[PDB]
Design a protein around this nucleic acid. Sequence first.
RNA 1: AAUUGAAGAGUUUGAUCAUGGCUCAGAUUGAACGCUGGCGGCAGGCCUAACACAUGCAAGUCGAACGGUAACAGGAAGAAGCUUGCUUCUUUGCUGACGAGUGGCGGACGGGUGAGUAAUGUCUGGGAAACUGCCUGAUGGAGGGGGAUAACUACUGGAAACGGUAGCUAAUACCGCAUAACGUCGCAAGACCAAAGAGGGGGACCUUCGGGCCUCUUGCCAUCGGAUGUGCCCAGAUGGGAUUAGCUAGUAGGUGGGGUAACGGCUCACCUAGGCGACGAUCCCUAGCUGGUCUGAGAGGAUGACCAGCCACACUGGAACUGAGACACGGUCCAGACUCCUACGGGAGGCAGCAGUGGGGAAUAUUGCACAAUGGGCGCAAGCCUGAUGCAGCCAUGCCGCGUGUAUGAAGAAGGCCUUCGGGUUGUAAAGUACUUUCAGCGGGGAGGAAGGGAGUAAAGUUAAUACCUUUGCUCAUUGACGUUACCCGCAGAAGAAGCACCGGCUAACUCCGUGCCAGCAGCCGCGGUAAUACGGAGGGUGCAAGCGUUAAUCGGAAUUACUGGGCGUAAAGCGCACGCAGGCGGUUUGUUAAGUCAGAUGUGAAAUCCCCGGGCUCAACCUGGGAACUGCAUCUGAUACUGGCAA
Lengths: 205, 85, 80, 82
Amino acid sequence: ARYLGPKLKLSRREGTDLFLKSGVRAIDTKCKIEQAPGQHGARKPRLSDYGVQLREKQKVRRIYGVLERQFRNYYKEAARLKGNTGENLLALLEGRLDNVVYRMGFGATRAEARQLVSHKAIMVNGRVVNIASYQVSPNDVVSIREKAKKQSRVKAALELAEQREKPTWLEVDAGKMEGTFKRKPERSDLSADINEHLIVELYSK
Amino acid sequence: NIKSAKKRAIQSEKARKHNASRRSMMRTFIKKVYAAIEAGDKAAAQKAFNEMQPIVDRQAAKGLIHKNKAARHKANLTAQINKLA
Amino acid sequence: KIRTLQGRVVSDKMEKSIVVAIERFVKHPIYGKFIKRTTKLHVHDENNECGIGDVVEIRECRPLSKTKSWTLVRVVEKAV
Amino acid sequence: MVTIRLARHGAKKRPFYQVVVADSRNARNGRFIERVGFFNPIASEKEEGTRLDLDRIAHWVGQGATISDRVAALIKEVNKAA
RNA sequence: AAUUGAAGAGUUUGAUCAUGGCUCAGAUUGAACGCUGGCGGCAGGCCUAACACAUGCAAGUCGAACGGUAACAGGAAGAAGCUUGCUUCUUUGCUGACGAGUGGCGGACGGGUGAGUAAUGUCUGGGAAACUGCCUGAUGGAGGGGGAUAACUACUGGAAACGGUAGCUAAUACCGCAUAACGUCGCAAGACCAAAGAGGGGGACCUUCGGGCCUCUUGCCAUCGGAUGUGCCCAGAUGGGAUUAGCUAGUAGGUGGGGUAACGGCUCACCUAGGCGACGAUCCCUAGCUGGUCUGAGAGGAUGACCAGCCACACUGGAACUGAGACACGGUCCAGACUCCUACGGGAGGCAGCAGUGGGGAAUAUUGCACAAUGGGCGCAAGCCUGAUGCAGCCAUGCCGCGUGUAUGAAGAAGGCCUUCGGGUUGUAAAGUACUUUCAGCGGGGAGGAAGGGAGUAAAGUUAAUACCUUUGCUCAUUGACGUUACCCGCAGAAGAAGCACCGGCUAACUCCGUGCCAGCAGCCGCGGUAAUACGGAGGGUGCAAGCGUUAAUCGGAAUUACUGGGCGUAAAGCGCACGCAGGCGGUUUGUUAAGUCAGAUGUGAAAUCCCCGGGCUCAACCUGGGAACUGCAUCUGAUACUGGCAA
Ligand SMILES: [Mg+2]
Ligand SMILES: [Mg+2]
Ligand SMILES: [Mg+2]
Ligand SMILES: [Mg+2]
Ligand SMILES: [Mg+2]
Ligand SMILES: [Mg+2]
Ligand SMILES: [Mg+2]
Ligand SMILES: [Mg+2]
Ligand SMILES: [Mg+2]
Ligand SMILES: [Mg+2]
Ligand SMILES: [Mg+2]
Ligand SMILES: [Mg+2]
Ligand SMILES: [Mg+2]
Ligand SMILES: [Mg+2]
Ligand SMILES: [Mg+2]
Ligand SMILES: [Mg+2]
Ligand SMILES: [Mg+2]
Ligand SMILES: [Mg+2]
Ligand SMILES: [Mg+2]
Ligand SMILES: [Mg+2]
Ligand SMILES: [Mg+2]
Ligand SMILES: [Mg+2]
Ligand SMILES: [Mg+2]
Ligand SMILES: [Mg+2]
Ligand SMILES: [Mg+2]
Ligand SMILES: [Mg+2]
Ligand SMILES: [Mg+2]
Ligand SMILES: [Mg+2]
Ligand SMILES: [Mg+2]
Ligand SMILES: [Mg+2]
Ligand SMILES: [Mg+2]
Ligand SMILES: [Mg+2]
């Protein structure tokens, strides 16, 4: 299921930071990003349109820690749901609990924020939801369970969570360690450096 | 074949003979009628009809000939006799 | 009435064993062109009168003969 | 004789019945004449769980039909009017 | 709101444009195989031999129809075990019950499989000539007799299967007889037909103490109804082939008898000489049909597992009997093929029910659990039965979810790999440090699927009635196969949990070494003869991930059968030429027709499925409310430009 291997290796090949070591340090280095994902990593890949089309979606995928199966389905869904396929894709992708967990800053990385979910230490509108892909929706309210509340990770987590741009469509707390999904993130939130209609094209032929 | 209602096999046979006899006695008395008709006798014809009448209606009720079956008989016969009888 | 067809005779020459044609037109379910799908029907007429080539009106009844479930209702034209 | 009974279109361990009028001799979840309700035995306190077209039912019942032990039960439970 | 949705690439050439086939990206699968493999939820699981089958189980139930006791249970005048209330056997069917037997209902349902069938089928839509158990509306019946028989007893034949004789007995078995209309025959007058009782409780009254009698309940007969089921008839549609063009004697029709529940060449006798067919008969080949399924932008193409509907079959061929229904899957009869038992004389049996076996195959599961639920049979009931069904087991077959850890961690260790020896890479990867513990493990807790039935009691509907019964509340004790259920809590330790294909181009991913037209690769092009990114190993990388690849298979791209949507001068393609039947098409005007065509209305188009908006399982798959859609068909009414007919 979960990728599980070296995390930075990805960011290097995908050419950008993917916040998989999300924790302490910033603007990598302390890594080596770029000039050698492997033994010939330096060499410029004068790569095809298929190549780029492949890597964008791959990028978005290495980002949320999702495998082909689920991702392919996300697309399938977006496409169904009214209005612009490429956007709904991203919408769906964000409605992911584990993501809404990390986004609210309860976890350093998206992974950590996910392990949190898996370990019944999170609760939508009250009851525990231990499955990563649980779809969060408007007005929903996620909160760390008292049982393991203010524990090592989540302190630091909620900490450098403000170091980050800090979202908009939601409302943290940090005391009650709860947060409210106010609205389905607009297109304009997030992204810029992610180019949907490519990963649309990809899954479109 | 070994299964309770082997019984039914023996039952159905009781019935089989039962109906066989009357079913026969019926159509005998029925013949009797066509006999006189083919002969020319108008009297024996009515005679036969009036004895076969009850036994048809009769069997019908008990139910080895069922209703409309009877009717026809009275019907065809009646028509016949008073064609030249 | 309850429904009824017409169509030219095509064969009178048998003791009430009258047979009637019934041309139609139909869309070919695949190439659009309209084409002629004929239907012949064994129809009863008593006292034989409908004649070869007469147009005639026809209604659907209970089984007369094996083959016959229609009777005529009227006639229309003759001496073709 | 035609009867009203629970055809069972649930799902393993989560039954959900289609109550239906039919020829009593037909398969449980088979040929029926009309649907005349449904009965979710999980339903739960939430909301819906025993919609029941009383109008047709008791017209078939008058029409001649008869009723399951477990259907009539839903009726003297549905109360009838309130 | 609810079909508002379409991509191209490689390869003939030195090169080019065209023509054209091959090939690839996609989706889908009841799949197999190689490698690998942790958990769960829903599902799926002989596609082959309609091959053959050991064993268990798949249909019984009713003592409130009947004579009844042989089992085990109480009890009993009475005979006693005797430790004078604890109770032993003789017996007695006295009653709770109940083997066997008669009887009623069910064994025509549920479940299995597509062999046969190109039309006794299916689908769409219609019609007239019919029956229809149980259930239900109405209206009357429900009299009075008779002769039987199984069981049983005696004798008695067989290895068994199963019998023979003679008695002997009950009924809701059976048969007369009465009665006989709003039934059947009949224009009428008339004539003619039925049945069955069993139970619950109960005031006097009284009885041969068995009951009468009162009372309800239930069963029985007839007639007309309903409802469901079924039979029938019509038209259209439902595969291929002309290297099949003629087919047909009950054949087509008429008349009369017979016949069926019914119309009917259904049958017969006679009469007519008909009937079918190039709009495809006949013959051959293949085949269950549908809802739908997969695919496709659509049109289409392909398909008919799992769910539902219809049909057909039940070892093979044939037949009927019983019955409301059968020409009967676990019924009978005949023939056959085959197998088993045998004491040798004779007997028995049919898994295409569940599980299981042999066999065949690339390949398809346990000889499990339970009637707790839903549903079916019987029964007043309680119940009993139910391999239907609910569940469990097996298999990554699939779909969906989840896990196999999270952070931190550098001059970046060692090792490997490359290196122009400067360094690069594996790589934040490892180690190390903090942290979390879902899942599996262990331990505790603990929903729902349960409604109902049982005693009571209450009130009411009844009646002589406060009995009974039915009804509706009240309490009380209860009912779960799944089950170590879901879900909840604690516990320990990152602890038990990653593999497969690929990296020449198409196509995301490159180096070295080995090999040297060998070994070998190869979907297509093409790689291999000394620097091989194409062979094999390695390091690295890309893609997937409890799956990964290979093979097989349908559609796609393929506008490559072109209706949508193509071609024929030189690329495949104009018959050597003409005449012309059928067939197709046909200038122009008016009238009429209204079949095509168009309009509207109505009915119909099963549910499921698909889709839209919702709701329910922690999400999801899955389940589910409601719409939408079923682009079709049919009847009626219209409109008359265009087409068809008619007329001039
Ligand atoms: Mg998965
Ligand atoms: Mg006649
Ligand atoms: Mg070349
Ligand atoms: Mg293995
Ligand atoms: Mg008994
Ligand atoms: Mg009787
Ligand atoms: Mg009488
Ligand atoms: Mg009597
Ligand atoms: Mg006749
Ligand atoms: Mg076949
Ligand atoms: Mg296309
Ligand atoms: Mg099945
Ligand atoms: Mg047979
Ligand atoms: Mg019969
Ligand atoms: Mg069998
Ligand atoms: Mg089996
Ligand atoms: Mg084998
Ligand atoms: Mg089963
Ligand atoms: Mg080194
Ligand atoms: Mg556990
Ligand atoms: Mg419970
Ligand atoms: Mg409850
Ligand atoms: Mg490349
Ligand atoms: Mg290879
Ligand atoms: Mg070399
Ligand atoms: Mg095509
Ligand atoms: Mg062409
Ligand atoms: Mg040429
Ligand atoms: Mg020429
Ligand atoms: Mg539908
Ligand atoms: Mg939900
Ligand atoms: Mg005209």
